[PDB]
Structure formats: C-alpha cells, structure tokens
Symmetry: C3
Subunit: 454 residues, 3 copies
C-alpha cells in the first residue's frame, strides 16, 4: 500500500558520504533497502558572494547550496543535524520528499553546539530540495540554507559520464550589486522579492571561468538542478544547447528536447545534456537581467573537435559573457582588500580595472582600446581622455552623446550611462585605461568618483 | 464535431447548489446532460483580511473565493448574476471554460440591484477560474472577485474521501502587512505587483489552526486549487507530503508524484493527496516570503496513528508555523477593537501579545521565556528587561548585538531587527512579556513604540 | 547519432523568405534537407510604443518581434546578419535551437554598416526564440531585439487554416505608462523587473481593433507564441476559448485542452485554436495588471454564425476591453502631435478624449454620459460638472465620495481616484465631456491638470 515497500532495512548500516557542490556522491549501486545514517552540520560563516563583497552565509555543511545527500527509495534514513558551536542562531531541516509534518522540522530543532536526530523512510523517488525551517524561515533560506537530496529509484538512474550539482538562489544585500564590504541581509528587499544577486552555487562566478563544469564531445552530463529561492522562479535555460530530458522532483512526466524550463521556488529537476560540439554552454535564469546583471550564469565547458557541419562559429567571449569570460576576477578581490588595508597601489587598481573592463567597456571600445573606425572612439592614446580625466568619470557615470573629436576623427553617437557601476569600479576601470595604451598614467580614486556622482 | 456532444438537455432543470469555501458541492452523479440554473449574487462588504485589519471585499456569494459551481460536461448552464442593491460598483463575470467572447462578460453586466443572465454549453471538462470582468478589471479581481467552476467529465471524477476548495490571491492594501484598521485598495502596489498579503481563501489564518482542513490516515483528499491572482504565480507546494496527481484545468496531461507545482495567475489545478502519517501538512506558495511573511499558508491536518517506520518525528509547532500554530489569534482582533473603542486594558494587550509572541519571539526566547543557556537570554524575570523597558522597544525594532549581561550571565550574540512589526504589535508583545514570568508589569503603548521608531 | 541526420544538403540553395509579424512564412513543403540562406538586418529606429509615445527600438528586420524565420530540421542554415549603417550599437544573434556556443553569438558580432555570417545545422525541431546577445544583453533585448525561428519536423506540421506570430515583451520607459514623448530606456526599472509596458508585438494595440487577427467559425488557427522577456514569465491565456494543443519549443510533451499556460522568459510555444462561435478572443498575460493596465492584450476575431446552443451572449465591448474595444485610438496620436507643434485645437482634444473615455469612464457613466439611475450620476448636461470644471479635474485625479446632487438627484457612492491618468489624458477626457451632451464647452489643458495634481 505505501510506495517504497521494499521490506525492512538489510545489510549493514551505511554512513552516507555527502559531497560539496558542484559534485555529487556516487550512485548507490545497491539492490536492497538499507539504514542510512546522514550527518550534516550547520555552519554560519562569512564568504565572498562576489569579489570584495562578503556576506554572512548560513550553511548546511559549509557550502551554498548545502551538501548533496544521495539515498535509495525504500531506505530508512537516520538524520543527524548538528549546529556548530560558533552559530548564533538555532536551525533545523525540512527535506522535501519526507513523509511527515514539516519534512523533519519539528524533530530537528538544534541550538548552537547541539545535535538532533530523526528517522524517516524515503518512500518517494526523486530529486528534492531541503532547507532550513526555523522562524523567520525566509531569512534562513535567504542566508543560504538549502540543498538537494536525491532518492534514487530502486534500479538506479541510467549511467552518464558526469553528474553535477547546481542550485539557484536569490540573495538580498543592503548594498547594491557589487558594492564592496560585508553586506547585511536586507529584509525589506527580501519581502519585496527584489534581490540584489541571483546566483548559482552561492557566489558570482562560482561556476564560470576556471570554476566551470567540464565534459567532452560525445559525453552525457546529468545535472541535478535546484532552486532554493527563497522567492524567484527560474526560467532555466542552456545557451547553445538543448536538454535531452527534464524531470521534476519524482514526477512521472519527463519532458524531452527542451531548452527553457520553469523551476518553481523550492523546486528541483534532473536535466540531461549530450555534448555535441566544443565550447562553453551557459546555464542561466532567462529572466535576462538576473543572468546578465545579477550573477545568474554558470558554464559547462566542452572540450573536443569542432564539427563545421553542425556549427561553424567560435567559442564565447566577453561580448556575451562580459567580465566572466576570463578565468577569474581575483584582481578585484585583491584591490578591495588593499583599499580596506590602506595600501591600494596604482597597479592594484590597474589589474582590477583590467578584469572589469572586459565586456563592460570592451564590447564597444575593444580589448585593445582601439574602438571601431567611425563607430566607437578609441580609449588607446586618447587625446580626449587625457584632456580631462574628470570628464571621463562623468562619461562613465552619466553617458555621452553628440559630436566629439577623438584623435582627429569625429564621432556622433551615444554612450549609454553606466550609473550602476560602483565608485571603486569606475575608479579602477579608469585607472586601468589611464595606465594602458600610451595614456598618461595617474589614477582615479573611488572618492573622486563619489564626488562626480554627487 | 464540438466536444461535449452528448445531446440536448434531458430530465428536469436542475438548480445548482453552490458551496462556500473550503467546501465543494457533491458530485453531480448523473448520466445525462441537463439544463443547470446557476444563481450567484455579488456582495460588496467589509471583512477581516487579518486580525484587526478590515478590507472592503467585492465577492461572488459573500466569500473570497466565491461560491463553488459544479456542473457536468455537456450541460447547458443558464447563468444568473445578481448584484446586491448595497453595491456601489457594477459587476459581471468571465468564466474560464465558457466558449464565447469574454467567457460571459458582455452579457452579464449587472448594476447594483439588478440581475443579468446568459446561457452557455459546458463543452470543456476541467477545473476553471471565474472572475469579474468589469473595468478596471484588475481592481475588481484584486478586491476578491474570483472563484472556481468544476465541469466534470461525463463519468465523474474518481471517488475520494474528501474534497476541498482552496484559492490563492494577492492583495494590495495601502498600509503595510498587519497594520490595523480599514485598509484601502492600493492601485500603485497592484500595478507594481507588490502585494501586502498573499492568502488562501481571503484572509490570514483562513485555513490554519481551528480552521484547518481535516482527514484521517489512509484517506484520500482531492483539493480544487485556484489562483485568482490578480498577478502572482504560485510555487504551490505541500510541506511534508507529495501530490499523487496534479491536473491543470481540463488538460489531458496529468503529472504524478510531485511536491511543488507552478500555478499560473488565473489558473487552476486538481490535486490529490493520500494521508499516510498524522500531523499538519502545510499548503504554501513556496516563494517563501509569501508563505511566511504575507499569509500564504493553509493546513491539512491528519488524525490517526503514528507510524515510526515512516516518520519518527513530531507534529509541527510555532518554530515553523509561527503565530499560526495556535488555534486562532482572536485576542489580537479583540485588542484592536478595544483600541478603537478607547477601552484597551492591560489584559487585552497581554492576551494579544501572547498570541503574537509565538514563533516571532519564542523560536529563540522559548514559550516560557527561559531562553537557552549560553545562546538566547531569558525574558522570564529578566533584570535587563526590567532595568529599561524603553531599551526593550529599541531592541525589538532595531535589534541588539554585543556583549550583554542578563540575570548574571553573559551573552554575545545577535538579535536581528524586527522593524516590520507594527507599533501595536511591539506594544502588545512587550506588555505580554512584562506581565509574565515575574516581570514587573505595567504596559507599553503603541504611541510609546511610535516615538522610538521615529 | 546526432538528431536531424537526414544527409547532406541537396537540391538548390534556398533563400529564406522571412515575414513580419503577425504573419508567418509558408510551410517549407520539402522532403529533402537544404542549404538555407537567411539574411536579416538590424535597424535601430523610433516607433510608437503607444499613442503619442515614441521609443527607440532596436530591431531585427524593422519590427518587434523581429522577422520570422522558417526552416526544416536537418537543414544547413547559412546565417547572414547585417547591421544598418544608421545604427549606433553593434549587434549579434543567439538563436535558441542552434547547437553551438552562444547560439551564434561570437560569430555574429556586427558593427554598424557591416555584415557577419555563420553556418549551423538545425538538428532540433521546434519553435525557438532568437535574440541579440551583445553586452549589455538585457538592454538589447529590452529594446526589442528578439523574434522566432521555426524548425519544422521533416514531415511538416499538420495543415491549419491560419498561422500567426505573436510575441510578448516587457518594456522599461523612464516615464510612466502613457506619458507622452520620446521615452528613454530605464535601466533601473529593467533591473528591478518593473516594466512600464507589457506588450504583444511591440506596441499597445498592435493586435487589437483594426489590427486584430482574423479567422472564421470552423477554422483552425495555429499561433507561434514567443516570450522575448527580457524578464517576465507570461500566464498566457485565451479569454473565452481553449487551446486544443500547447507545445513548448521542440518538446516531446504536448498538453491538450488548456486555457492558461506559463511561458518562460525566453520561451516559445505553438498553440492551436479551433473557432467555434463568433466574437473577439483575447490573448492576455493573465497576470492581470499586465493585460489591463500595461498593454498585454491581443485579439483573435472570429466571424460567422452565432450558435445559441453554445453561447447566447454578446460580443465584447469596452466594459472588458476598455479603450481597445474601438478600431484604433489615432485621435490620441494626432492630439499629441498637435501639442508638440503648438497647434492643439479644442476638436483635437475632444476626439482624443472620446477615444480615452471608452471603458475608462464609460463603464460607469455610459457611452452617452447618462449614467445609471440611482447608481452613477450623469456627465450628460451635468449641472455639477458645469458648476466647477476645476472640481472635475480633482474628481478624476483624486476620486469623489459622499452625498452629492446632480441634475436634481442624490448620489451617495464612491468614484475611485484615477491618478494614473496622465495630465494630457485627464485634460482631453474632460474637454471631450465638456463639448458633448449639451455641456458648456471650453477646454481643460494639460497644464491645468498639472496644477491640480501638484
Ligand atoms: C558602447 C555601447 C559603449 C560602451 C559599452 C562604452 N562606451 Fe565609451 N563611448 C562610446 C561611444 C559611442 C562614445 C562616443 C560618444 C559620442 O558622443 O559620440 C564613447 C566615448 C567614451 C569616452 C570619451 C571619448 C574617448 O576618449 O574615446 C570615454 C573616456 C569612454 N567612452 C570610456 C568608456 C569606458 C571606461 C567604458 C566602460 C566603463 C565605456 N566607455 C563603455 C561607446 C561605448
Ligand atoms: C533569535 C533569532 C531571536 C528572536 C526571534 C528574538 N530575540 Fe530577543 N534576543 C536574542 C538574542 C541573541 C539577544 C541577545 C543579544 C546580544 O547582544 O547578545 C536578545 C535579547 C533580547 C532582549 C534583551 C535581553 C533580555 O532581556 O533577555 C529583549 C528584551 C528581547 N531580546 C526581546 C525579544 C522579543 C520581545 C522578541 C520578539 C519580538 C525577540 N526578542 C525575538 C535573540 C532573539
Ligand atoms: C465607476 C467606477 C466610475 C468610473 C469608472 C468613473 N466614475 Fe465618475 N463618478 C462615479 C460615481 C459613483 C460618482 C459620484 C460619487 C458620489 O460621491 O456619489 C462620480 C462622479 C463624477 C463626476 C461628478 C458628478 C457628475 O457630474 O455626474 C464627474 C465630473 C465624473 N464622475 C467624471 C468622470 C470621468 C471623466 C471619468 C473617467 C475619467 C469617471 N468619472 C470615471 C463613478 C465612476
Ligand atoms: Cu537555519
Ligand atoms: Cu520547502
Ligand atoms: Cu466586479
Ligand atoms: Cu480570466
Ligand atoms: Cu543588439
Ligand atoms: Cu536566449
């Protein structure tokens, strides 16, 4: 009568091995139901949500999303939740897929330095979100308290070459996007569902550049995709590919051959991809400003031979991926820390500005600052730049239009304002430009930009 | 050629018996098509959207959602809409599932004190939203003008033990969440899709506590779930359970074994649940701040024997459900009315504060005010509280951090601000605390809190 | 091994014939794979987003959405993107359905006056969004850079009587809804996902009135429905009908017999409708304030015989469709241009006000200004209006309640405020009323209303 009716646990008790994102535990590879002991510890800690931007995350297992749990339908799971002594808050857990009130919540309340346990049978196959369930629930979830549990079918999932773990969340900082420093949680933005960041795996760039997911032409890739929310619904999409299969939770329905699929807040799906041609495939929330303005992009990078019969074109670059085309933006972290320490050098600024110039400025002005004849004026050896570095701050913040002369040529176009750039970002970008391409050197400070903005 | 081609109406004309939420009319239990006469009356009236918060609802049949209508595919429906003489606005109806322009709208315009009628054939089986269709349509829908009509398949739906009627809506008050008094509709929040409340069945607590839906272990429950909007899409989810089946409108596709499912604005679904273990199962919009900060939670409470093989844990409490764990919050309504009348007593405040303290404060400070050793300081017989009741107002509104001494013990933690609490709520909560646990008595007034907030 | 494995291209190279919305190219009607040459040109230009409201759109082929492209699964597509010399920005393309990084983006970067090309095989059948992929991607998409490409199955889609092309988008103007003039793109509203317009096919009224889609009773209609976003998810719905079929992208799953269906940002679906009774069927985003307050309504108008057995009622009118019931609102465009030119006459205002009065005022006051006895007072020959035209400006902006006397009769009701109306709209509406129905004439100016609003 109950699903998952495979008899009492047999064999030996199994201690679950949990993995950190973006990795997944191995398939259970088991033909009998077991007692599975799961131990998960809550840790509150600061981490970088973006370069030079710290946030106090609340985590299951030290990561956002939390550690991945993998069991078999019909297993009896003895769930142990610990809360690290350093925690200020109590925490608990609601696992979707659990049959019982709160998905475990009332029997997993755990004060700092304590441990709780409860037992459940995994009656329901599927991929499922788990999350904290402690008042105020939204604050806990917003601070990163979510992950995935996979309950396998008894026969296991079909074999694939790679399995990965990707989870979207919306985040609410007091400061604006890319404003540096330790950013508090912002309850007002959270209630209004107005996130400052929308991320995969807890940070900007968590899955881009040198942190990309990998596979090779011809391989299959399964991705366990969660949406921790707390509030957003993801228009989840793969740029330049298709999903062979998309299956939500433990649903009977499987959709095949779709590129764009809606993942509810608190939802999860298993997607399958087959690599056909090399290059970078971007996982996004196709509510586009999330993907391109708030951090909601991840990369699956495929290595192998080009097939000109299928696609003649080139790998992605900064025109599309912006400043996440490059391996990383570590120079930005280093410049921000140098500013805090009072040791910020011109070169710290130049290297940070170099990272930030990609896409943001280079789409028009080019990576070498040459511009494009008749269309975009040069930043390289620019007389107009050199003539008035203050004017340049105004141009970045407030745009520029009308006829101008640069290096003896007339331009009569429109540079849109870029007011969303933070003071340090404008300063560092301009300091990069001034110290490149035979420009006159010197520097622009965040304080200089603050004054022009005001 | 047309669907629902079951011949002319036969038998006798049937006068439809409509039900008020959360109840549903009985199955039609009929093998022939009939002429079904439906009579529905619009009533504009004030009701409580939350305790002590009045709202002028516009209703079909006196409730939000409106009366449930149940007919059989192939029926000829003669639809009579009356508008009560007390109405200020004209009203009409668009029933999804109707084949014809506006779903009835142009032939159901009805001024106060009037009646309109129109006839349609129910060609389409399914569950369908109906709503008002009078300019400005969004205002009408926002004020509560929506419900469900079920068009059964000719053979009927499979028998279940219980059928219930649950409908989500987003609401737009001029005041903030839980600000007392008669709250006007707020057009600006509505246009921006920024609701102050997100509710099931027209009120906070409409389906919680003593108003929960009921069933017993082993029983099946069918829920007709609507989303009246006007604007939100529900990440509709059952905490601690799974839906055996989810079917949208009259779709051919049926999803099985899912826990989280997206319901469009203006959409409807039929979900099935089988009770397996006792306790409270929470229906939520899993865009979490709606569920936990704006009212979007309902309860299906299952009675019966525990099954420790399936779930070893406990029923839900205020850690998860907050102040909706208790049967009701009537003390809040009574205190608010006493304030209006100028008769507010200390005990009125104490009992209101008692209701509001649950979850909101008790998650940390505990239901007996004892706190937790080394972690959360006591409110019970608190020297620190007694020493400066004004400081306590500041602590609730603006939080507290750093080393403090309470009852001879050091704490060095963080109480987050609770600025979203209204002045009366802080006043009543603190008055409760002061009159409990050997604390010194007295009271805090809403005016006292207003001054500290300013 | 790869899908679409139908061999090398054969026959002659085919130059694709692209269509402008809401039309679709003819079925490919071809049994062999071909080399298909597609030429699409980007044009930046001002167009009217609403009457008297200009916007600088960025377009593929001069329209929003862009030109429709129709090919066959297994075709080799040689894609040529041109950027008109008048462009200020560079542009490129990402076609969903393309197998390769960026869906073409890196190999289609095209400066003003240039052309790019790349080749891909259409491995994936389905309906797919294409869009620009140039940093800042959200700005490009927000400015109108999206369209659809259909990749047919090898056997073709089933024949229907009509095929149409409808695409939703969200738009972000600096000014509020219906504020006249050339409206800049508003980055802040875009990041916050707070659109001022939500439209089908690039403009208010693009598919209403004299621009409605057409078919006849008994005919089948296929609509290729895109959602360009950038940010919104459409609760896509047909008022007064049902979709026989809804199929997303190239998915295997087909839903049948649904009225309301969620289309992701960047998503696309093929829907089928069978006309059964005459009248206007409204395609909306059923997040209702979008449909009724921001422009998100389109019409499929069915001609033919009434069938009283199916629906006894009347065609839609301004009670539901508001000011889009009429063929067009050209008088508003003409009045706005007359204001710019300094030649605005009383009659220009009267005719603009006539257009705007429909629904907005007529729902209560009636199309002849008679009101409804005991319920809504007359505007026709209104003593109360004539007595104080300034008071009338205040009534429109700020509402009216309480007992009043009009033409010898008492009213004691509530006219809600209509503060969202722009100054010119109030002026023109009141000038219409004053010059109708034996009212005293004269005029109200936008400046008059500006002063009352302040
Ligand atoms: C294309 C959309 C651009 C992006 C992105 C950026 N800039 Fe730009 N810039 C652009 C144009 C079309 C113009 C000329 C405007 C005109 O009136 O014709 C400019 C101009 C400048 C200048 C001044 C001229 C010069 O020295 O060449 C500066 C200093 C400049 N732009 C800097 C700059 C930086 C630092 C950018 C990233 C932050 C950036 N621009 C983006 C077009 C575009
Ligand atoms: C956990 C998240 C808490 C919730 C919810 C509430 N309070 Fe709290 N409170 C908390 C901590 C960790 C502290 C100490 C902070 C420190 O600096 O170490 C406090 C403190 C108080 C106090 C002062 C100390 C005392 O008298 O014990 C008061 C008066 C107090 N808290 C009241 C209070 C009320 C009324 C709450 C609901 C509105 C509430 N707190 C919530 C932790 C938490
Ligand atoms: C119903 C929801 C209404 C809509 C839409 C509009 N008006 Fe109205 N109006 C309405 C009522 C119930 C009243 C009387 C209020 C009372 O206190 O009883 C009015 C009144 C007016 C008046 C003044 C009285 C008169 O001259 O008849 C004016 C000038 C007026 N209304 C104008 C007006 C216009 C121009 C509207 C569209 C912009 C409009 N009203 C909408 C009800 C409703
Ligand atoms: Cu927690
Ligand atoms: Cu959950
Ligand atoms: Cu109404
Ligand atoms: Cu509707
Ligand atoms: Cu572009
Ligand atoms: Cu895309």
């Amino acid at each position: 009568k109950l699903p998952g009716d495979f008899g009492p646990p047999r064999g030996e008790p199994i201690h679950a091995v949990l993995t950190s994102p973006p990795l997944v535990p191995p398939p259970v590879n088991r033909t009998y139901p077991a007692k599975v002991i799961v131990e998960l510890e809550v840790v509150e800690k600061e981490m970088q949500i973006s370069e030079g931007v710290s946030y106090t995350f609340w985590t299951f297992g030290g990561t956002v999303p939390g550690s991945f749990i993998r069991v078999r339908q019909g297993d009896t799971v003895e769930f142990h939740l610990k809360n690290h002594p350093s925690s200020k808050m109590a925490h608990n857990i609601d696992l979707h897929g659990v049959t019982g009130p709160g998905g475990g919540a009332a029997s997993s309340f755990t004060a700092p330095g304590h441990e709780s346990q409860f037992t459940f049978k995994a009656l329901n196959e599927g991929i499922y979100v788990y999350h904290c369930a402690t008042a105020p629930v939204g604050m806990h979830i917003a601070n990163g308290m979510y992950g995935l549990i996979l309950v396998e079918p008894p026969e296991g999932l079909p074999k694939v070459d790679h399995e990965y773990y990707v989870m979207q969340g919306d985040f609410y900082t007091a400061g604006k996007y890319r404003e540096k420093g330790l950013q508090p949680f912002d309850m007002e933005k959270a209630i209004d569902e107005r996130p400052s960041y929308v991320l995969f795996n807890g940070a900007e760039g968590a899955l881009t550049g040198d942190k990309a997911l990998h596979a090779k032409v011809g391989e299959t890739v399964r991705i366990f995709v969660g949406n921790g929310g707390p509030n957003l619904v993801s228009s989840f999409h793969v740029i330049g590919a298709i999903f062979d299969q998309v299956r939500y939770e433990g649903g009977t329905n499987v959709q095949k051959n779709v590129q764009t699929t809606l993942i509810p807040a608190g939802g999860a799906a298993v997607v399958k991809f087959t690599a056909r041609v090399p290059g970078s495939y971007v996982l996004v929330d196709h509510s586009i400003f999330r993907a391109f303005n708030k951090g909601a992009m991840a990369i699956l990078k495929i290595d192998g031979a080009e097939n000109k019969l299928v696609y003649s074109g080139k790998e992605l670059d900064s025109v599309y991926l912006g400043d996440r085309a490059a391996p990383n933006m570590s120079a930005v972290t280093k410049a921000t820390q140098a500013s805090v320490s009072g040791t910020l050098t011109v070169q710290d600024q130049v290297q940070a500005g170099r990272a930030l110039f990609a896409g943001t400025c280079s789409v028009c002005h080019q990576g070498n600052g040459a511009g494009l004849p008749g269309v975009f004026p040069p930043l390289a050896k620019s007389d107009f730049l050199a003539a008035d570095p203050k004017r340049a701050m105004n141009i970045v913040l407030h745009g520029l239009n009308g006829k101008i002369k640069v290096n003896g040529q007339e331009y009569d176009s429109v540079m849109p304002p870029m007011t969303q750039l933070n003071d340090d970002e404008v300063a560092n970008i301009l300091t990069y430009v001034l110290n490149s391409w035979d420009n006159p050197g010197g520097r622009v400070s965040a304080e200089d930009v603050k004054k022009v903005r005001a």
